[PDB]
Subunit: 89 residues, 3 copies
């Protein structure tokens, strides 16, 4: 099966659902008006997510794994950027 | 292995744990007094979840996947209902 | 692939990422200053997580599964303790 991860914020709410399928992760988005495909598209076979609001600004962290490798991706209001996470050391 | 997804709300807290096993997803619940089996029972091989409170009312979204198909299930205070989510388009 | 689960709290934030690899789950931690390996180390092939704050005290629940067995682990300010969760009955 594909593998998903979901997060939400606020009371509208906004929702993001990440799906790993055949080695790629894609993103679907709800902001109160319908579902649309988001900008996030990166390699991975497994995905997890968390998020937090600072006032009205959302911060999202997506953990994309393949084999024994995990890469963190970061949204902080502009774009997706690889983060500093490593699984060890 | 079975695959689980967990969410919580409030400070009691309430917890819900969803488990995919042999193509079915079941639900376990804590509201401060012990664990009990919940009403949610739907097909799926993979599960994710998120939730949010509006005041004192919980909203839960369970994303149930099998193969390349994902179905969203919705709790909004009464019962479980299929949602509008699709993985594409 | 390894399988991960992530939670966060506050606005710093703190983040915890749990990774199941080859039958063991390990923990990585961010509290604003860098990533470090946490104290959590228990058997499991699949992991989920949730957490909640009571004021300034974090409570974390990690659901560690192997085959059809799921064990809950609990952090409530001191250490990791097996919880009362069972998947049925
Ligand atoms: C992608 C990344 O590494 N983000 C870091 C951030 O990097 C800075 C760069 O963005 C740029 O400004 O150059 C400086 C060096 O001069 C840094 O490399 O630095 C932040 C400062 O601590 C990191 O912390 C978070 O920053 C967020 C906003 O960008 C936010 O304020 C958050 O609260 C901070 O903790 C940021 O780290 C990333 O986010 C944290 C939470 C972890 O997920 C970490 O692994 C990420 O890389
Ligand atoms: C199951 C579903 O589709 N729920 C929708 C909801 O559907 C309405 C029906 O419940 C009924 O009232 O008939 C009307 C048309 O006349 C709609 O079909 O409509 C809501 C309005 O936007 C959707 O939005 C959420 O509604 C929640 C309470 O029911 C809550 O207020 C939430 O804040 C709203 O965003 C609701 O969509 C479902 O929930 C959202 C968050 C997504 O998960 C979406 O995919 C779900 O279908
Ligand atoms: C590990 C565990 O079972 N924790 C229980 C907690 O057990 C108590 C023991 O810690 C000790 O004090 O002895 C008494 C009997 O005299 C109990 O066995 O009991 C708490 C009381 O309800 C449980 O509830 C949570 O306690 C947390 C702080 O420890 C916190 O206040 C939380 O809000 C309470 O709901 C605690 O249960 C564990 O946590 C809950 C949320 C579930 O995850 C449950 O399965 C856990 O075992
Ligand atoms: C903050 C926000 O909602 N931005 C929307 C745009 O990006 C989408 O949301 C962010 C948080 C991240 O999940 C992106 O990968 C995602 O595409 C979005 O493109 C736009 C739609 O027209 O709406 C913005 O509000
Ligand atoms: C709001 C709430 O806690 N409702 C409980 C009932 O349903 C359980 O919780 C909801 C949120 C959802 O997870 C259901 O699938 C689940 O069964 C529950 O049946 C009842 C137990 O007697 O207690 C209610 O409070
Ligand atoms: C509350 C807190 O942040 N405690 C830190 C110590 O434990 C780490 O965090 C807790 C919540 C749990 O995830 C542990 O398994 C984890 O190791 C930590 O060891 C210490 C680092 O020097 O810093 C504490 O603040
Ligand atoms: Cl950004
Ligand atoms: Cl409802
Ligand atoms: Cl403790
Ligand atoms: Na989630
Ligand atoms: Na649509
Ligand atoms: Na942008
Ligand atoms: Na969770
Ligand atoms: Na019990
Ligand atoms: Na009902
Ligand atoms: Na998460
Ligand atoms: Na480092
Ligand atoms: Na300690």
């Amino acid at each position: 099966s594909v593998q998903t991860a979901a997060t939400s914020w606020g009371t509208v709410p906004s929702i993001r659902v990440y799906t790993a399928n055949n080695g790629k992760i894609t993103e679907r988005c709800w902001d109160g008006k319908g579902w649309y495909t988001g900008a996030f598209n990166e390699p991975g076979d497994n995905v997890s997510v968390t998020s937090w609001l600072v006032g009205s600004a959302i911060h999202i962290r997506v953990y994309a794994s393949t084999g024994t490798t995990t890469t963190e991706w970061c949204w902080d209001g502009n774009g997706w950027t690889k983060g500093a996470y490593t699984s060890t050391n």
